[PDB]
Amino acid sequence: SAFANLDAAGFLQIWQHFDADDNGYIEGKELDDFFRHMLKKLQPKDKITDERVQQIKKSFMSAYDATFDGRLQIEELANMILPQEENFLLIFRREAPLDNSVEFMKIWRKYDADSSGYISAAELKNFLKDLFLQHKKKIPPNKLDEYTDAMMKIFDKNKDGRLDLNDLARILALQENFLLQFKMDASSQVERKRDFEKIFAHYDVSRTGALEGPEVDGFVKDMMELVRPSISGGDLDKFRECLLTHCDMNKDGKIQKSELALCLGLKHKP
């Protein structure tokens, strides 16, 4: 029921429907329909009307812009709709599509071998160098600088010297981010843990330290079902492969508790 704003990832998903050619614009007379998609994405159960689209659409920009039916460049609509963090993430991903999580995980493992869920902020630029390499991608030294320094802005404000996986994972250019699938609010990173703790407790009957197979499957359904309900059936497989794909170390087929915590936005403090 709370106000729910469109993030950079969502903004792109809807945008692409209108700019499949990726010219970077959409007809300005189509801003009314761009909002119906937004409203339907944010409030999935709401029954949207034409009147509502106008009321919401308008509240999002100047009275003047409301009449702006001309060509709107992607940066313009994003500037009129997305907050900074999600905004900068939109521009960064567009100029540096880094849509390879397989290697993100690997690079994350290097700077966070115990899967605490954080990397020392001192390793940022070093980190951004490796990520581009696994993507075999090269950029100018300055752009790397700007990016490194721009990210410290939205990920290290507390300036406590540490960046969190829940933030850095967001720089990836993935329509549906392998990880960014969970709630990220106040107690949302709390409640999810308690339920994560008891749920990891149940399945690991032998009390070893890792779940394998049915245990991993049972956890998943008895985890995600409550994280983000109304999920498909076959929509647990890639969830189960992505694990031993982007988490566990050896090919044991087991899923360690700490590795598992990472993907949940949570963090297992041993």
Residue 237 is labelled as binding a ligand: no
Residue 46 is labelled as binding a ligand: no
Residue 22 is labelled as binding a ligand: no
**Domain with 120 in it:** 82-182
How many independent structural domains does the chain possess? Answer: 3
How distant is the alpha carbon of residue 98 from its chain centre? 13
- For residues 11 and 88, state if they share a domain: no
Could you give the CA distance from residue 87 to residue 110 in angstroms, rounded to a whole number?
29
Residue 103 is labelled as binding a ligand: no
Q: Give the tokens for residue 5.
A: 């704003």
Checking 196-205 for CB contacts under 8 A at 24+ apart, the result is: 196/223, 196/261, 196/264, 196/266, 199/223, 200/257, 200/260, 204/257
Could you give the CA distance from residue 232 to residue 227 in angstroms, rounded to a whole number?
14
Q: Is 264 exposed, middle or buried (0-12, 13-18, 19+ CB in 10 A)?
A: buried
Provide the CATH number for the domain around residue 208: 1.10.238.10
Point out which residues pair with 25 in neighbouring strands: 73
Taking the chain, what is the end-to-end CA distance rounded to the nearest angstrom? 36
Residue 176 is labelled as binding a ligand: no
Residue 130 is labelled as binding a ligand: no
- For residues 193 and 175, state if they share a domain: no
Residue 167 is labelled as binding a ligand: yes
Last residue of a domain, one of 49, 64, 81: 81
- Deposited experimental method: X-ray
- For residues 59 and 100, state if they share a domain: no
Which alpha helices (DSSP H) does 165-254 contain, by range? 165-168, 188-203, 214-227, 237-246
- For residues 90 and 172, state if they share a domain: yes
Provide the pairing of β-strand 72-73 with 25-26.
Answer: antiparallel
Residue type at position 107: I
Phi/psi at 53 (5° precision):
-55, -45
Question: Who's near 119: CB < 8 A, 6+ residues apart?
Answer: 108, 111, 112, 127, 162, 163, 165, 168
- For residues 113 and 198, state if they share a domain: no
Residue 240 is labelled as binding a ligand: no
Residue 160 is labelled as binding a ligand: yes
Q: Give the tokens for residue 179.
A: 């990880």
